[PDB]
Design a protein around this ligand. Structure first.
Ligand SMILES: NC(=O)CCC(=O)N[C@@H]1c2ccccc2-c2c(-c3nc4ccncc4[nH]3)cccc21
Length: 207
């Protein structure tokens, strides 16, 4: 396991998301499903020129997996995934410019729900999660686990878990008062409200 320090802009945004009083927390799911949809668009587009991009899996889908025993809500996709370079470096650049633009917009009257317009909607996961584990597999790299409970640092390690083939799993270790997001009725309500027209099958798993 390797440990990395977040740059100051991202660190401040993670603190804002964790600490600000904001009741409309459900938007996190729309954001993560929308990120999953974009990653699926990317692998599908690549496959149009190179069909072998799908040798790691032809199915293009989004799975919503709650687990009451573990208190986790996992968003799984068979999208493009992320390489180690994406996880440590490329996404750190996106997170910096995106945070600066979002922090700017917030001072200019914008709402926390507009986070996705700034390329950092992934961070809305901290509205409901005390820890986020991202398991990912990109065609050009190995399976990795990125993780952060904020506090200024994140970890990256080669993942020994079940081989995914290709894609990303966003594991939300829910805060104790956010367990409503493990309830079938609640997840169904949110998906219907914000994600009804996503162009991939979304399966809401049950227990
Ligand atoms: N389903 C998908 O494939 C969506 C992918 C996704 O949401 N990716 C998100 C994402 C989106 C926008 C910005 C950063 C990141 C990020 C990071 C990340 N933040 C960083 C900050 C500083 N340094 C390095 C960093 N790496 C790590 C795992 C997953 C993601």
């Amino acid at each position: 396991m390797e440990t990395f320090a977040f740059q100051a802009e991202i660190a401040q945004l993670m603190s804002l998301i964790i600490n600000t009083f904001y009741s409309n927390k459900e938007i996190f799911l729309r954001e993560l499903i929308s990120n999953s949809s974009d990653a699926l668009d990317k692998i599908r587009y690549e496959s149009l020129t190179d069909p072998s991009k799908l040798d790691s899996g032809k199915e293009l889908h989004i799975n919503l997996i709650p687990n009451k025993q573990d208190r986790t809500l996992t968003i799984v996709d068979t999208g493009i995934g992320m390489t180690k370079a994406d996880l440590i470096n490329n996404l750190g650049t996106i997170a910096k410019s995106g945070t600066k633009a979002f922090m700017e917009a917030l001072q200019a009257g914008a709402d926390i729900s507009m986070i996705g317009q700034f390329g950092v909607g992934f961070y809305s996961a901290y509205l409901v999660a005390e820890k986020v584990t991202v398991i990912t597999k990109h065609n050009d790299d190995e399976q990795y686990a990125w993780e952060s409970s904020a506090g200024g640092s994140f970890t990256v390690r080669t993942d020994t878990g079940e081989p995914m083939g290709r894609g990303t799993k966003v594991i939300l270790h829910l805060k104790e008062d956010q367990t409503e997001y493990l309830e079938e009725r609640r997840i169904k309500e949110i998906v219907k409200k914000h994600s009804q027209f996503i162009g991939y099958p979304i399966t809401l798993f049950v227990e």
